[PDB]
Structures are given as C-alpha cells and as structure tokens.
Amino acid sequence: MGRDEAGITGTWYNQLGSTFIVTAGADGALTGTYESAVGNAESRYVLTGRYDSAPATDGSGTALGWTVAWKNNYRNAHSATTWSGQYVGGAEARINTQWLLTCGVTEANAWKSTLVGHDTFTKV
Amino acid sequence: MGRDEAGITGTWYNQLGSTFIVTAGADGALTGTYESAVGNAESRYVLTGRYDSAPATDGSGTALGWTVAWKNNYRNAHSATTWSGQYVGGAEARINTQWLLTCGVTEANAWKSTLVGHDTFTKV
Amino acid sequence: MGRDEAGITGTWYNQLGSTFIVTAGADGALTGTYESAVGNAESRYVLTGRYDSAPATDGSGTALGWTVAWKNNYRNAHSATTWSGQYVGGAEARINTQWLLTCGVTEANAWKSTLVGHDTFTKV
Amino acid sequence: MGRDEAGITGTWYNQLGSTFIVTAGADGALTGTYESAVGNAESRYVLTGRYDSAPATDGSGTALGWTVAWKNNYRNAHSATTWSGQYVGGAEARINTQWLLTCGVTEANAWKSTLVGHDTFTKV
Ligand SMILES: O=C(CCCC[C@@H]1SC[C@@H]2NC(=O)N[C@@H]21)NCCCN(CCc1ccccn1)CCc1ccccn1
Ligand SMILES: O=C(CCCC[C@@H]1SC[C@@H]2NC(=O)N[C@@H]21)NCCCN(CCc1ccccn1)CCc1ccccn1
Ligand SMILES: O=C(CCCC[C@@H]1SC[C@@H]2NC(=O)N[C@@H]21)NCCCN(CCc1ccccn1)CCc1ccccn1
Ligand SMILES: O=C(CCCC[C@@H]1SC[C@@H]2NC(=O)N[C@@H]21)NCCCN(CCc1ccccn1)CCc1ccccn1
Ligand SMILES: [Cu+2]
Ligand SMILES: [Cu+2]
Ligand SMILES: [Cu+2]
Ligand SMILES: [Cu+2]
Ligand SMILES: [Cu+2]
Ligand SMILES: [Cu+2]
Ligand SMILES: [Cu+2]
Ligand SMILES: [Cu+2]
Ligand SMILES: [Cu+2]
Ligand SMILES: [Cu+2]
Ligand SMILES: [Cu+2]
Ligand SMILES: [Cu+2]
Ligand SMILES: [Cu+2]
Numbered sequence: 001m002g003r004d005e006a007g008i009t010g011t012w013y014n015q016l017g018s019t020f021i022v023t024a025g026a027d028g029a030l031t032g033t034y035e036s037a038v039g040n041a042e043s044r045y046v047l048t049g050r051y052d053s054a055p056a057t058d059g060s061g062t063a064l065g066w067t068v069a070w071k072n073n074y075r076n077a078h079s080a081t082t083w084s085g086q087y088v089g090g091a092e093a094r095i096n097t098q099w100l101l102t103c104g105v106t107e108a109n110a111w112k113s114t115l116v117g118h119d120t121f122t123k124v
Numbered sequence: 125m126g127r128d129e130a131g132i133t134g135t136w137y138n139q140l141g142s143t144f145i146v147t148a149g150a151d152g153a154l155t156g157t158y159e160s161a162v163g164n165a166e167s168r169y170v171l172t173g174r175y176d177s178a179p180a181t182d183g184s185g186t187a188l189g190w191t192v193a194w195k196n197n198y199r200n201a202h203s204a205t206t207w208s209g210q211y212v213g214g215a216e217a218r219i220n221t222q223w224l225l226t227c228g229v230t231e232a233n234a235w236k237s238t239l240v241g242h243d244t245f246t247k248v
Numbered sequence: 249m250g251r252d253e254a255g256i257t258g259t260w261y262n263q264l265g266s267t268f269i270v271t272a273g274a275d276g277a278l279t280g281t282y283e284s285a286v287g288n289a290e291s292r293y294v295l296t297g298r299y300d301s302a303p304a305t306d307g308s309g310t311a312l313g314w315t316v317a318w319k320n321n322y323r324n325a326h327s328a329t330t331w332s333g334q335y336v337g338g339a340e341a342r343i344n345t346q347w348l349l350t351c352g353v354t355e356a357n358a359w360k361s362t363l364v365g366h367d368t369f370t371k372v
Numbered sequence: 373m374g375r376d377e378a379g380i381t382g383t384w385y386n387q388l389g390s391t392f393i394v395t396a397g398a399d400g401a402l403t404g405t406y407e408s409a410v411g412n413a414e415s416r417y418v419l420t421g422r423y424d425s426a427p428a429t430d431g432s433g434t435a436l437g438w439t440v441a442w443k444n445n446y447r448n449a450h451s452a453t454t455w456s457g458q459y460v461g462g463a464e465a466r467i468n469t470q471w472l473l474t475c476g477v478t479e480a481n482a483w484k485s486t487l488v489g490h491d492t493f494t495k496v
C-alpha cells in the first residue's frame with residue numbers, strides 16, 4: 001500500500017469550512033469530491049490528483065496535489081483550482097497547501113485570470 | 125463530448141521542452157503522462173486532472189488543471205507539481221499555466237517547500 | 249496622515265519568529281528593517297514598500313507590500329522577497345501576506361528561481 | 373556603484389504595454405514610477421523596491437523586487453502589487469518577474485484577495 005494511503009484517505013476540512021473527501025490509492029492516485037464553503041460553488045465537485053506513495057522516512061511530509069474544475073450538475077463557474085502541498089501525519093494530522101484558481105477569460109483579461117491562496121486541512 | 129475534448133487531447137510541449145500527453149474525457153477528466161526536460165525527473169510520470177467540459181462561448185479560455193507526483197519506476201523526487209491554467213483554441217492553440225511545485229520537507233523547512241512558475245504549452 | 253499610519257507603524261512578528269520593523273509615512277511609504285528567523289540571513293536588512301494611505305471604510309483591509317533584498321553588511325544571499333498583503337486593524341491587528349522569494353540564477357535554472365509562501369504578522 | 377546600477381536604471385516595458393521607470397541606487401534602492409496599461413489604473417504611481425547591488429559573477433541574474441500601491445491623485449484601487457524577479461543583462465536585457473496583487477477586502481472575502489501573474493520587461 002502507499003505509505004500514507006490510510007493516513008490520507010478520508011474526510012478533511014479546511015479553515016473556510018470546505019469539505020475534501022479523498023481516497024488515496026496504492027498507485028499514487030487521489031480521487032474524491034470537494035465541497036467549497038465559499039465562492040461560486042454548490043454541492044460536490046469531482047476531484048482527482050496524485051500523491052507520493054513512497055515518501056521519505058526522515059520526518060518529511062508527503063507531497064501531493066489535486067484539481068477541481070468548478071462544473072457540476074448545479075453550476076459551472078468556468079474555473080479550476082489546483083492545490084499543491086503535503087500531508088503531515090501525527091496526532092494533529094494536516095494537509096498544508098497552496099492553491100491556484102484560474103478562471104476561463106478572454107485574452108485581454110488573461111493578466112487577471114488567476115487567484116493564489118493557501119488552505120490548511122485537518123481531520124476535525 | 126466536452127466542447128474542447130478534441131482540442132485538448134493530444135501531445136503538448138512547453139518552453140522548457142517538456143512533453144505533456146493528455147486525453148480529455150467527455151466527463152471533464154484529464155489523464156496522461158508528463159515528461160520533464162528539467163529537474164529531478166526521468167521518463168514519464170502519471171498525471172491526472174480536470175477541465176471545464178462546457179466552457180463559455182464568448183471567447184474565454186477553458187479552465188483546467190492537473191497534477192504530477194514525481195515518483196515513477198526510475199526516480200522519486202518526493203514532490204508534486206500542479207498546473208492551473210486555461211486552454212486557448214485557434215490556429216496557435218495554447219495552454220497557458222501557472223504552477224506550484226511542493227517538496228515533501230520537515231516542518232522546520234516548510235517555509236521553503238513550494239516553487240511557483242509559469243509554463244506555456246503549444247502543439248508544436 | 250494615512251488612515252492606518254499609526255496602526256501599521258511599529259514592530260511586527262510572523263509565525264516563523266521573524267521581526268518586521270516598519271514606519272508608514274503619510275505619503276504611502278513603508279520603510280524599515282526585516283530580520284528573518286530562517287534561511288540565509290543574519291541581522292537586519294533594509295526594506296521599502298508602499299501601502300494604501302486612504303483605504304475603504306467598509307471594513308476592508310488596507311493593501312500594502314514591501315521588498316527585502318537579502319544583502320547586508322554580513323551576508324548576501326543573492327535573492328529578494330516581496331510580501332503582498334493587507335493590514336487588518338482591531339484588537340488582534342494582523343498583516344496577512346503572501347510572498348515571492350526570487351533567487352538570482354542562471355537562465356538554465358530560471359524555472360526553479362522562485363519560492364512562494366504566506367506569512368501572518370501580529371503585534372505580539 | 374551597484375554592479376547593475378546602470379543596467380537597471382531607465383525605462384522598461386512589459387508584455388501588456390505597461391511602463392516601469394526606475395532608478396537603481398548604489399545602496400540597493402529602487403525608486404520610480406509605474407504606469408499600467410490594464411486594470412483600475414491611470415497615469416503614474418509611485419514605486420519603491422530593492423535589488424542585490426553585488427550579484428554573483430557566475431552568469432546568474434540580479435534579484436530584485438518592487439511594490440506599487442494603486443493610489444495616486446486620480447484613482448485609488450485599494451490594492452498593491454509586488455513584483456519579484458531578476459534582471460538579466462546582455463544585448464536583450466530583461467527583467468523577468470512574478471507578481472502578487474492583493475486587494476483590500478473584508479475578512480469574509482480574504483480567500484479571493486490575491487492575484488498572481490508574471491511580467492517580462494524589456495528595454496524596447
Ligand atoms: O468561485 C469559484 C468556484 C469556488 C472556488 C472556491 C475556492 S478554491 C480555493 C479555496 N479553497 C476553498 O475551499 N474555497 C476556495 N470560481 C470562480 C472564481 C470567481 N471569483 C470568486 C467568487 C465569485 C462568484 C461569483 C461572481 C464573482 N466572484 C474569483 C475572484 C476574481 C479574481 C480575478 C478576477 C476576477 N475575479
Ligand atoms: O525536480 C523535481 C521533479 C521535476 C520538476 C520539473 C518542473 S514541474 C514545473 C516545471 N515545468 C516543467 O516542465 N518542468 C518543471 N522535484 C523536486 C524539486 C527539487 N528542486 C529542483 C531540481 C533539483 C534536483 C535535485 C536536487 C535539487 N534540486 C526544486 C528547488 C528548491 C526550492 C526550494 C527549496 C529547495 N529546492
Ligand atoms: O535564504 C534567503 C534569505 C532569507 C529568506 C527568508 C524567508 S522570506 C519569506 C519568509 N518569511 C520569513 O520571515 N523568512 C522567510 N535567500 C536565498 C533562498 C535560498 N533557499 C532557502 C535557504 C537556504 C540557505 C542556504 C543554502 C540553501 N538554502 C531557498 C530554497 C530554494 C528554492 C528553489 C531552488 C533553490 N533553493
Ligand atoms: O486594477 C488594479 C490596479 C492596476 C493593476 C495592474 C496589474 S499589476 C500586475 C500586472 N502588471 C501590469 O503591468 N498591470 C497589471 N487594482 C485592483 C484589482 C482589481 N481587479 C482587476 C481590474 C478591475 C478594475 C475595476 C473593477 C474590477 N476589476 C482584480 C481581479 C480580482 C481578483 C479576485 C477578486 C476580485 N477581483
Ligand atoms: Cu527517498
Ligand atoms: Cu502553506
Ligand atoms: Cu474569476
Ligand atoms: Cu477586480
Ligand atoms: Cu456559462
Ligand atoms: Cu501565465
Ligand atoms: Cu525541493
Ligand atoms: Cu536554496
Ligand atoms: Cu474607495
Ligand atoms: Cu494569506
Ligand atoms: Cu534559492
Ligand atoms: Cu531542490
Ligand atoms: Cu556571492
């Protein structure tokens with residue numbers, strides 16, 4: 001199995017109150033759903049990503065990333081967010097991320113297409 | 125089908141000479157392989173992502189994103205990159221992205237865990 | 249005077265234990281010194297920046313930014329960090345930032361020149 | 373003098389058609405004005421920043437950064453941009469940057485406060 005397959009798989013919550021439901025596969029896959037507490041979003045969106053299934057054993061975190069395109073059966077916000085970060089195990093397990101949200105825009109507006117931020121996910 | 129299913133599917137090349145091989149599914153999925161011309165990487169890595177399969181029709185680009193975890197059968201760089209951007213169709217089709225590369229690090233080094241950059245992909 | 253001239257001027261501390269000493273001028277200027285608890289840095293470095301001296305009065309934060317080039321009389325790390333963020337007044341005043349650290353590198357290494365992160369500064 | 377004092381001082385133009393007028397001081401200071409071809413901006417804005425006045429001599433670029441707060445006598449966009457990058461000398465001298473634009477927002481909107489992008493400046 002991936003070293004942190006069981007540690008990563010499950011339900012996570014960020015500081016905005018969003019809900020990140022993920023399954024980590026033995027092959028390095030991340031699959032699941034994302035529900036954002038903010039923005040032009042309602043209900044669950046498909047996500048997919050990858051993680052390092054054989055991380056270092058020196059106390060370093062486990063690198064990972066995932067994408068949500070903000071289209072589902074309810075809404076289409078013509079945008080996608082990618083989260084890049086690491087899982088940190090332990091009693092207070094965390095996934096610490098930085099993210100890039102890109103909106104589909106015309107070429108004249110490309111300069112203002114991308115938001116950057118940071119989300120921390122916990123199991124509680 | 126996704127509006128830009130055929131436009132996105134195929135082989136793309138960025139300004140570093142890296143090769144991005146992707147299939148866009150009707151459901152919004154991106155699957156394929158990435159081969160980086162630079163860094164701690166050799167041969168192909170699995171990628172997965174998402175794209176807006178019903179973009180706006182006002183000339184705006186098509187938002188998308190994908191992730192590579194830098195582990196394959198040859199090397200493990202304990203890191204993952206996410207690319208966030210948009211596909212722009214036309215005679216000179218492009219995927220314009222910004223990216224976040226996170227390395228698995230100890231908590232004392234978390235402040236220096238993440239690189240940011242920008243890649244432009246073309247069909248030639 | 250700037251609306252938050254007095255609120256911004258003073259000594260601030262971030263989550264790494266770094267010390268940000270700043271004077272906000274009536275004209276929108278920020279001047280002062282930065283001392284980083286981490287990285288290739290020792291003692292104080294010159295900083296300069298700008299802030300919105302007439303912010304909105306609807307509860308929004310006060311936008312600002314500053315730069316440190318990491319050369320002083322002790323060390324030269326051939327790099328510069330810019331912090332971009334906002335000051336949020338109140339009992340628990342904060343400056344919330346995201347930052348970009350660029351290292352001087354050869355053109356072959358330009359893709360790995362820039363780190364991104366986020367620092368929160370408090371008065372305690 | 374700074375190694376690239378003369379190389380940096382002058383008028384620069386980016387890919388959007390914006391105009392960056394800068395003087396590099398022997399002490400590492402950057403001062404000047406910025407005029408953006410895009411966004412909520414008109415005429416010139418004050419800028420200030422820092423650069424490495426004693427860069428490496430191995431062909432590496434010269435790290436630098438600067439800030440503009442988007443208030444002048446004509447408009448106040450309640451925002452600030454920081455550019456972080458490097459100057460690359462030679463026949464086709466360039467300043468390659470990544471930038472963070474933060475808007476002053478209420479705490480409920482802090483997640484969408486910051487844009488990220490990249491500008492390349494040339495002498496022509
Ligand atoms: O909301 C969305 C989809 C939901 C995004 C939720 C984000 S993911 C990163 C973060 N972690 C999280 O848990 N939740 C948030 N996609 C278009 C994102 C439009 N803006 C923001 C909201 C909005 C809704 C309606 C009308 C205008 N805005 C982005 C701001 C912006 C920046 C630059 C130019 C123009 N607009
Ligand atoms: O290379 C990797 C995997 C390959 C990454 C390729 C990147 S994806 C974004 C971009 N688009 C692309 O087409 N190609 C590049 N993963 C660890 C990334 C270590 N550094 C860089 C190289 C290196 C190799 C060996 C030893 C040291 N470095 C990152 C620099 C850094 C930043 C902060 C702290 C420490 N190190
Ligand atoms: O430390 C510096 C100057 C100090 C930087 C302090 C940072 S500002 C943002 C943050 N807020 C803060 O309060 N403190 C930190 N400038 C070169 C920054 C080299 N690396 C990190 C340390 C290091 C010291 C010696 C040898 C190798 N590293 C950056 C990692 C990197 C990324 C990509 C490619 C290569 N390296
Ligand atoms: O324009 C400004 C000041 C000018 C900014 C110019 C930028 S600096 C980086 C770049 N290099 C350059 O040469 N030129 C551009 N400051 C508020 C920036 C509001 N948005 C964009 C324009 C706008 C004008 C009026 C109404 C709405 N927009 C930012 C988009 C955004 C993102 C997230 C949430 C909400 N909005
Ligand atoms: Cu290893
Ligand atoms: Cu973080
Ligand atoms: Cu948007
Ligand atoms: Cu705006
Ligand atoms: Cu639509
Ligand atoms: Cu771009
Ligand atoms: Cu690394
Ligand atoms: Cu380093
Ligand atoms: Cu106003
Ligand atoms: Cu922040
Ligand atoms: Cu460095
Ligand atoms: Cu490295
Ligand atoms: Cu040196």
Ligand SMILES: [Cu+2]
Nearest residue numbers: 468469470490
């Ligand atoms: Cu760049």
Ligand SMILES: [Cu+2]
Nearest residue numbers: 451474475485
């Ligand atoms: Cu804004």
Ligand SMILES: [Cu+2]
Nearest residue numbers: 039040103484
């Ligand atoms: Cu918006």
